[PDB]
């Protein structure tokens, strides 16, 4: 339940993803750079923030 989630869960989630990376993939994956590994940074919102330099 969304209303049952306390504020300490988000602090724990920051500890969980520490050091870890995630894979961002955009289709079509024409070449191998279509999948790249990024260190996730927790943000408020619902959209993935992409670095400008990896857009090409």
């Amino acid at each position: 339940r969304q209303r049952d989630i306390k504020d300490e869960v988000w602090d724990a989630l920051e500890e969980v993803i520490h050091g870890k990376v995630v894979l961002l993939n955009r289709a079509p994956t024409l070449h191998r750079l279509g999948i790249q590994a990024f260190q996730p940074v927790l943000v408020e919102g619902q959209s993935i923030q992409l670095h400008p330099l990896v857009c090409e």
């Binding site: 602090d11 500890e15 520490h18 050091g19 870890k20």
Partner: protein, 93 residues
């Protein structure tokens, strides 16, 4: 980039050998609870928590940092696999 990644790549003949060593070292640290680390207390990776600084729980970060020190010996056919495990169990229960 990962810290010292250029130095890490220059220590192996193939970049994929670097990943194997880091991943195998990370599992060794996880299996024995980071008690087999070659890192001195001033060198242990730390994470910033609300309460305070604590040991970094990411073993891959530890494995990469340990390997830069040069205290890890890696290669093929170093020790028997069963002999390596039983010896590491005794030293680090």
């Amino acid at each position: 980039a990962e810290p010292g990644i250029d130095k890490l790549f220059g220590m192996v003949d193939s970049k994929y050998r670097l990943t194997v060593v880091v991943a195998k070292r990370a599992q060794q640290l996880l299996r024995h609870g980071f008690k087999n680390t070659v890192l001195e207390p001033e060198e242990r990776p730390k994470m910033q928590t609300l309460e305070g600084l604590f040991d970094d729980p990411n073993a891959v970060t530890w494995a990469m940092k340990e390997l830069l020190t040069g205290r890890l010996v890696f290669g093929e056919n170093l020790v028997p696999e069963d002999r390596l495990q039983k010896e590491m169990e005794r030293l680090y229960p």
